[PDB]
């Protein structure tokens, strides 16, 4: 889909998830998806905010967590 | 800019306005335009440039 493809940079985030994701080196969402609730947990400096956060940014393009995709990117 | 106004205010003139000095308001101008220049927010506008 090109929306996971997308850069992380125009999902709306703040700064800190910008940072947190840096550390995490996570440029597209497709293989983002695939990453479960921990392996965003695992992130330096991360807490509950920035996951809710991320959440609720992929709900709102109908997206979260955990999902499969094949050859990808 | 003068939008919806009359003549425009400087960057000095804007900062006295409410409460600031003109650094201050220089950095709030700098945050909307980073803000318009972003995606999202920035569709309509593109249009009306139609470049």
Known sequence: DPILLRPVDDLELTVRSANCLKAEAIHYIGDLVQRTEVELLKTPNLGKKSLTEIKDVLASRGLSLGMRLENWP | ?51
């Not at chain 2, 950095?27 to 909307?32: L, P």
Request: aromatic share 8%; proline share 2%; glycine share 4%.
């Open chain 2, 1 to 51: 800019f003068g939008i919806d106004m009359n003549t425009d205010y400087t960057l000095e003139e804007v900062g006295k306005q409410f409460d600031v000095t003109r650094e201050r308001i220089r950095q709030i101008e700098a945050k909307a335009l980073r803000k318009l220049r972003h995606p999202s927010r920035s569709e309509v506008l593109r249009s009306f440039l139609d470049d």
